[PDB]
Amino acid sequence: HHWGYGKHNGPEHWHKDFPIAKGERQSPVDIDTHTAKYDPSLKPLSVSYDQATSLRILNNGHAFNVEFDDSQDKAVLKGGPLDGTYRLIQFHFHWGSLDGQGSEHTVDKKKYAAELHLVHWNTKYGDFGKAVQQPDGLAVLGIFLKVGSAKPGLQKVVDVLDSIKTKGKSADFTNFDPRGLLPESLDYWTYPGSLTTPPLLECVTWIVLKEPISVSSEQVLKFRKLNFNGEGEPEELMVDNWRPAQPLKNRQIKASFK
Numbered sequence: 666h667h668w669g670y671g672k673h674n675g676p677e678h679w680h681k682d683f684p685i686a687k688g689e690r691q692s693p694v695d696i697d698t699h700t701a702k703y704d705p706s707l708k709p710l711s712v713s714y715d716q717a718t719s720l721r722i723l724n725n726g727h728a729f730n731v732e733f734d735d736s737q738d739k740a741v742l743k744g745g746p747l748d749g750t751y752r753l754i755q756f757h758f759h760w761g762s763l764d765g766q767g768s769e770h771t772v773d774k775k776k777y778a779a780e781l782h783l784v785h786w787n788t789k790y791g792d793f794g795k796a797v798q799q800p801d802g803l804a805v806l807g808i809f810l811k812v813g814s815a816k817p818g819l820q821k822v823v824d825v826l827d828s829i830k831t832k833g834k835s836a837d838f839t840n841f842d843p844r845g846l847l848p849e850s851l852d853y854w855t856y857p858g859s860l861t862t863p864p865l866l867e868c869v870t871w872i873v874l875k876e877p878i879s880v881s882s883e884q885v886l887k888f889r890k891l892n893f894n895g896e897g898e899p900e901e902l903m904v905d906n907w908r909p910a911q912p913l914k915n916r917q918i919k920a921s922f923k
């Protein structure tokens with residue numbers, strides 16, 4: 666259902682069914698770039714997506730997920746702040762009704778037009794459902810989107826959205842290469858946080874890339890034609906599916922770069 670992003674069931678209401686909403690390590694946060702400190706203990710970040718196997722794209726009524734075959738060690742994230750191997754399971758975005766909002770993390774209070782989350786689970790816990798009962802169960806790689814030139818590796822996503830307009834629709838989505846969504850630089854910030862949607866579980870190591878990708882206005886306009894509702898229900902455009910920044914509390918954001 667029953668949480669959402671509207672006035673009546675959005676982020677300011679989530680705490681009534683998910684009290685960890687007001688916890689000590691909630692996400693997203695504002696990244697104050699002058700306060701974040703370079704951490705020379707960070708080991709090199711390793712994004713290894715060459716054997717990623719995408720399977721399906723799903724409109725889940727909040728966003729769309731591109732799902733991956735995670736039954737073997739294919740597409741993994743390692744290094745950086747992480748101890749161990751984290752396996753890619755899905756990615757999705759958060760975006761706005763207007764270009765001036767849509768990201769979840771902010772940078773010196775700047776909001777980007779959208780934010781990509783590549784979600785990974787720590788293989789030492791055997792499955793995703795076990796990983797989300799652990800303080801180091803997940804790693805989410807976050808990438809900001811700004812509007813300008815088109816991102817050629819996003820267009821295959823854009824062009825399937827027509828087929829998954831409403832909640833509960835899915836389509837085949839094999840052979841998609843998530844490397845085509847990355848920026849050039851892997852400079853990042855990292856901190857310990859949470860899922861940004863209910864159940865808001867505090868299991869995530871966040872790794873947020875500093876360099877945004879550029880997407881075109883036409884690409885993000887097609888994101889904004891999706892629907893939160895099911896087929897045959899009144900149309901509610903899937904826009905503004907982001908949680909605002911949460912209190913930093915007793916956390917430090919570390920930078921990978923000088």
Ligand SMILES: [Zn+2]
Nearest residue numbers: 758759782861
């Ligand atoms: Zn997300």
